[PDB]
Ligand binder design. Structure first.
Ligand code: ZN
Lengths: 140, 171, 232, 344, 47, 183
RNA sequence: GUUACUCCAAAGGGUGUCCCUGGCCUUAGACAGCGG
RNA sequence: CUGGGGAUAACAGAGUCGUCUCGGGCGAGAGCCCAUAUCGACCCCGAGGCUUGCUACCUCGCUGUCGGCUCUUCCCAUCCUGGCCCUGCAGCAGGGGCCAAGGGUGGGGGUGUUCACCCAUUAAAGGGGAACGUGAGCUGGGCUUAGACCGUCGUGAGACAGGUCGGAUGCUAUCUACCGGAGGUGUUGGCCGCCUGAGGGGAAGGCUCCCCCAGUACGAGAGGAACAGGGAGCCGCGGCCUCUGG
RNA sequence: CCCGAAAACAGGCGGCCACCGAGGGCCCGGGAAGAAGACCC
């Protein structure tokens, strides 16, 4: 047991489906300067001939900032998907979906660049990144 | 420059006359005698060509420099009369083709020079005393490396008789 | 190797004569060297055009320039004309030269506030910001002095020779003497009854962490040191 | 150059119609327990349960959704014993012994049954086979079995098959077979709840299909879609070799293939249509009946996951020729809910 | 942490300067190439 | 060729019985009995009154080498059935002491470099191993099997991933059949 | 290797084996070993 | 426009290998000393036929095209994955070399582009051949007709291996080949059923990350592994419709 | 794991008939199978 007290990652047994390919615009839910981002990459993914990388809830993506204060605009950031419109299954068999697609901006390690998340987030995301539910007021 | 297998052989007529060859080049070799020239040494170690051959002046000069540096670092200028016996008289030519006209009017312009040697002919000689035959053989080897074909060395005494086997046995 | 020979021309007296030179030996030829213009050129003439084929009239040259030899008029074409270096080569050479300059300055220049060095990266940044006129045919060593002042105000710094006083408990002195004198300028090498080496060195001042870290790695962190005045 | 894997597998070729609707078993597992190594039944339908997870891995100890297939298994009848010997290359049949009293319907598969063949003749033949086996020539003993499709009113023409016996002693195998012949055999005497199984059946038919669906070929650019080539492959190959290669994807028969699956878990064995969960006896048949299959009434297997075949197709089962190293326990798991709502 | 017993069995080896193959202790030429230059396996660090 | 009738001879000691059965050599002595097959085209092994004689009647270099090799093998067999052979191993470590133990036909080594997994060496039949602290003895009646057991115990500890000037832990032979190993 | 030619890879190396020649030590020689 | 020409070019092929791609021998030296950890001048010896040239043996209505999409296969001179050796290899990483072609080698921006350049990921994002694989498979952006504009050359009609806009894409398969599906004869009388399994095919699997071993070995410190043991996922393959979507 | 008695040593076993007739096909009601044929009840 090396480093568990100060930690950024955990395990989740659900593995939702991949609903957002490269090119998708995400509304930002954290209280950072950014408002809208665009997906240009999915961390950890390897594909095939003429396949677009896609992401779902709990995955870390590489994105560009399109709207927000000039300090953040035109930069390449990392972020985590915290809710999606495409329904995904759980262990009991009941499906779950949300009202919109949204993300939260983090550091390559997994540390949030912000102190407040607005709206409900997914337990899958909160489980895989233990430093988010702390700063989220609703986790379903 | 171009590979030496182009000029190795001797199947072409001799081309050694400068009152008729237009634009012929000068030699890049000026020194043929090195060391001590008036010292009457005992043993004469001479290289010999194994077949007929055509040696470039570039190879000649490289041989000269290497062998002389070796003999200086090991034997000492006071010894080792070193001589190259052959002079470059042949003129080598290349066809100026590579817009071009290909094989139209092909007769080469002169590029370089070479020395012609026949079978069992002497190329170079080291005159040395007994206590440096090791280094004379080393020089033989070094020169052998830098030649287009193969060559063999022999040894001679005063009166110029072969004592190579007797001297090789007893070291 | 005419495949990638480039062109240089001199326009004067109402005509146009190109040449086919090696792009990296023309560099030396106009930089200032003992020049084998034979090796420089690709074809041994002077011509209207490299892609057409028309070598001009000998007495036309005689008239305009004054020479009969073609190598001499090509020499003067390279003198007073312009070479057709590709944008690739121009960019690459420009960058390499200004990198050379940035190193040549950083290695011995620092700010008189605290003695920190100025990294080559932000040296390059200050250059690109102020706007520097790097010549691609001039000698770097000789064009730096201008670039000094053109960038001093935007980024002030001085040529600040650091002078240091160093201690070693010599057990690896036979392992550090040569290594540390590779730098140079070692003054008053002194000793002690405990075989311990004490001295005062006068190296340039920009490179300090190199010296410190190499000494620490070579002595297993068993070295004492003190910075005397930064004699400029 | 762009690299990518080829489209489809070459391990299941030629992709042709199966030789028979009754599937053949090619290899048998090595078992120390002296028992019949398989059973056969008819596929009925699918449902789902909620159970507490047993197997190693994450999710262990939690309540999970599990899909389930139901296979109706009426008892088989053992009508024969075969002996095998070793020939030059492989095994060859040495002789057969049959029972004398067989159902009237067996003649629908075997049109030519013996005329008199009384019990004393049957016993004399058994004795001959026994003495033959008692020497040392014989190498393997197998049972001859037929289904009884008339109990569940599905049809009247039985399916006739051969099944191997576990162990490594021909004499033990023969004692088992001699105590079995002439009788009905149930699935609870052969299978154990919690086992892993391999299932064998012929897949659903789909007729002739093109390469997009038969091999996973791509649909061409929309210009080709408007040219008349959208659902075609580009070319059949290069100039040299000046022939079409067998590896090039083409249209042909799709479906109705012999296929084998690995490591499907047996959850529970039911009797007379009922399952006992917590003292209760509940019916697996959903309200309204299984779609395209009626009511289950005799005996049934509950198998995890999916299995090849249409609904009323004959299925064969064998134990785990190739199991993993971290098997789950051989014991019925804890089931919290079984769905028996309408399925249409 | 010197262990001469370990050294006598790790470092009693010759190496060929042409191909790099290892050779027995008393070899005069190499096995794969016939080169006559063999140097002992390095027992202290160089440079 | 080299000579005419190359012939080597061995004198049979106190109570050693040597027999030939067509290409095999049986050697019985106070302890144990050994067998070995030795054949090469043209080489004859036969027993005289009190001698082992190896003969070839028009030999080349390779035949001479074969003959001398066979002679050495027979001498080893004789010495083995007479006295025996004894090899010695030394255990060394810097950190993580490791425990070596004998388990049936295997030697097991634990805590080598701190690994959670044990290394295993196979003992050949007719060999006995004794562990007393940092020193190990392999005693046996036949030299090939004895040396092979020793070599296996050694090769169960070999590293490939780190510099051996620094990582030197393991087990090493120090004495072969009564012959120290020196650099 | 089992190739007359049409239509067959080298410089440089080899205690691989079979031969020829010429010197030098030998009844205590040329390795290793008891003993500086 | 007519008549002809493979007596003669562009064009693929044959030949050749100067050039090109890949190597070797010897040893001046560089490397604190130390040729050979690494680098290795000058000079000599080669392989391949994947670059361009040379020649003019084949074809003058065989097809005269570049690039892209789609589909299959082979070579190794190996980029990653498996296993080893030396080091100027403490550890983490790096250099160099040996065995191995089973699997992998992707997505985007400008440009008709191949190539080259840049971006973010990645275990890595190797390079070649098959008529510069593949138009009786597609496309038609470039190139190479007839229309038109600019610049330059020319008295002019006009031209430019200079730039720019626009500019036709045919087939009922005779033989063989392949994917699947049937009817016969033979197997020495006819028929029903169950088996064997000679031969052929297979990638049916490949790879990554996390936990623990462990802040341990190593190391002055900064930093920082491994064997075993536990989990999850991506790519590929084969099936099914209980659940969810169309 | 898939194909596989046309495997030319063109196989083994059990059973039925012949040495009027065993067996098979057309036909009829239909699919879980299907371009014609074939397959299954
Ligand atoms: Zn070597």
């Amino acid at each position: 047991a090396k480093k568990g007290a100060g930690a950024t990652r955990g395990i989740s047994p659900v593995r939702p489906t991949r609903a957002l390919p490269i090119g998708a615009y995400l509304k930002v839910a954290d209280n950072s300067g950014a408002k809208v981002i665009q997906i240009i990459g999915v961390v950890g993914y390897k594909g095939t001939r003429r396949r677009l990388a896609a992401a779902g809830v709990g995955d870390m993506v590489v994105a560009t900032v399109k709207k927000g204060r000039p300090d953040m605009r035109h930069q390449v950031v990392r972020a985590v998907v915290v809710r999606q419109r495409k329904e995904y299954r759980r262990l009991d068999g009941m499906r779950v979906k949300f009202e919109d697609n949204a993300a939260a901006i983090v550091t390559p390690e997994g540390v949030p660049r912000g102190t407040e998340i607005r709206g409900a987030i997914a337990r899958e995301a909160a489980e895989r990144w233990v430093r988010l539910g702390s700063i989220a007021s609703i986790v379903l | 420059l171009r590979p030496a297998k182009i000029d190795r052989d001797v199947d072409k007529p001799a081309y050694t006359r400068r009152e008729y060859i237009r634009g012929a080049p000068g030699p890049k070799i000026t020194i043929f005698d090195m060391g001590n020239l008036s010292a009457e040494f005992e043993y004469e170690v001479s290289l010999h060509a194994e077949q007929a051959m055509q040696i470039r002046q570039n190879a000649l000069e490289a041989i000269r420099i290497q062998v002389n540096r070796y003999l200086q670092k090991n034997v000492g200028r006071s010894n080792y009369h070193f001589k190259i016996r052959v002079y470059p008289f042949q003129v080598l030519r290349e066809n100026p083709m590579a817009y071009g006209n290909g094989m139209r009017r092909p007769f080469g312009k002169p590029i370089g020079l070479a020395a012609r040697v026949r079978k069992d002919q002497k190329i170079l000689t080291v005159w040395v005393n007994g206590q440096h035959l090791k280094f004379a053989l080393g020089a033989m080897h070094r020169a052998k490396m830098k030649l287009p074909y193969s060559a063999y060395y022999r040894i001679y005494d005063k009166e110029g008789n072969d004592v190579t086997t007797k001297v090789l046995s007893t070291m | 190797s005419v495949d990638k020979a480039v062109i240089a021309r001199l326009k004067t007296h109402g005509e146009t004569f190109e040449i086919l030179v090696d792009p990296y030996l023309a560099r030396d030829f106009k930089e200032g060297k003992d020049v084998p213009i034979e090796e420089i050129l690709a074809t041994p003439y002077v011509f209207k055009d490299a892609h057409k084929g028309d070598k001009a009239s000998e007495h036309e040259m005689e008239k305009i320039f004054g020479t009969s030899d073609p190598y001499e008029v090509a020499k003067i074409i390279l003198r007073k004309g312009e070479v057709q270096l590709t944008a690739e080569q121009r960019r690459q050479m420009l960058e390499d030269k200004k990198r050379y300059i940035a190193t040549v300055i950083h290695r011995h220049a620092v700010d008189p506030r605290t003695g920190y060095p100025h990294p080559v990266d932000r040296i390059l940044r200050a250059m690109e910001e102020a706007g520097v006129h790097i010549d691609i045919f001039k000698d770097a060593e000789a064009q730096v002095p201008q670039v000094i002042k053109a960038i001093r105000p935007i980024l002030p710094l001085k040529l600040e020779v650091k002078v240091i006083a160093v201690k070693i408990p010599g057990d690896y002195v036979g392992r550090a003497y040569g290594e540390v004198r590779k730098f140079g300028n070692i003054k008053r090498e002194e000793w002690g009854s405990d075989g311990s080496w004490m001295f005062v060195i006068e190296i340039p001042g920009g490179v300090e962490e190199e010296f410190y870290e190499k000494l620490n790695a070579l002595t297993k962190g068993e070295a004492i040191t003190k910075l005397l005045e930064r004699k400029g | 150059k762009i690299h990518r894997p080829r489209r489809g597998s070459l391990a299941y070729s030629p992709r042709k119609r199966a030789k028979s609707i009754v599937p053949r078993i090619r290899s048998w597992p090595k078992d120390s327990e002296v028992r019949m190594l398989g059973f056969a039944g008819y596929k009925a339908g699918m449902t789902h349960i909620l159970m507490i997870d047993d197997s190693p891995g994450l999710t262990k100890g939690k309540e999970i959704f599990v899909p389930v297939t139901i296979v109706e298994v009426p008892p088989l009848f053992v009508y024969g014993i075969r002996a095998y010997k070793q020939g030059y290359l492989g095994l060859e049949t040495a002789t057969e012994v049959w029972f004398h009293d067989l159902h009237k319907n067996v003649a629908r598969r075997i049109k030519t049954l013996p005329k008199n063949y009384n019990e004393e003749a049957f016993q004399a033949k058994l004795g001959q086979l026994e003495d033959l086996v008692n020497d040392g020539e014989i190498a393997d003993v197998r049972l001859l079995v037929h289904t009884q499709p008339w109990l569940i009113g599905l049809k009247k023409k039985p399916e006739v098959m051969e099944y191997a016996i576990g162990g490594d002693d021909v004499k033990a195998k023969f004692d088992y077979a001699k105590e079995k012949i002439g009788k009905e055999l149930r699935a609870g005497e052969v299978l154990h709840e919690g086992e892993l199984l391999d299932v064998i059946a012929v897949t659903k038919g789909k007729g002739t299909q093109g390469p997009v669906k038969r091999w996973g070929v791509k649909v061409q650019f929309h210009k080709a879609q408007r040219a008349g080539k959208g659902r075609h492959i580009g070319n059949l190959g290069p100039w040299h070799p000046a022939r079409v290669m067998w590896t090039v994807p083409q249209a042909g028969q799709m479906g109705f293939h012999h296929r084998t699956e690995f490591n499907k878990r047996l959850i529970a064995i039911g009797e007379n249509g009922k399952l006992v969960l917590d003292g209760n006896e509940i019916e697996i048949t959903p309200k309204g009946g299984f779609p395209h299959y009626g009511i289950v009434r005799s005996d049934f297997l509950m198998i995890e996951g999916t299995i090849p075949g249409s609904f009323k197709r004959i299925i064969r089962v064998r134990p785990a020729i190739r199991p993993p190293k971290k098997k789950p326990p051989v014991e019925r798991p804890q089931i919290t809910y079984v769905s028996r709502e309408s399925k249409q | 942490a010197r262990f001469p017993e370990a050294e006598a069995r790790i470092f009693r080896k010759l190496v060929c300067m042409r191909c790099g193959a290892t050779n027995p202790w008393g070899a005069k030429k190499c096995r794969k190439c016939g080169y006559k230059g063999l140097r002992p396996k390095a027992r202290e660090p160089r440079g | 060729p080299v000579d005419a009738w190359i012939r080597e001879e061995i004198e049979i000691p106190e109570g050693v019985e040597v027999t030939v059965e067509g290409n095999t050599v049986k050697v019985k002595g106070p302890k144990g009995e050994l067998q070995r097959e030795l054949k090469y085209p043209g080489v004859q092994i036969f027993t005289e009154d009190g001698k082992v004689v190896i003969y070839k009647e028009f030999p080349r270099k390779k035949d001479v080498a074969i003959v001398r090799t066979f002679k050495a093998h027979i001498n080893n067999m004789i010495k083995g059935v007479t006295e025996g052979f004894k090899y010695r191993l030394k255990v060394v470590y810097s950190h993580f002491p490791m425990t070596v133990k004998v388990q049936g036909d295997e030697v097991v080594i634990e805590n080598f470099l701190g690994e959670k997994n044990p290394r295993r060496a196979k003992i050949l039949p007719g060999v006995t191993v004794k562990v007393k602290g940092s020193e190990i003895e392999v005693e046996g009646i036949d030299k090939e099997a004895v040396g092979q057991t020793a070599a296996n115990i050694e090769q169960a500890t070999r590293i490939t991933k780190w510099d051996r000037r620094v990582f030197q832990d393991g087990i090493y032979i120090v004495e072969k059949a009564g012959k120290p190993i020196k650099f």
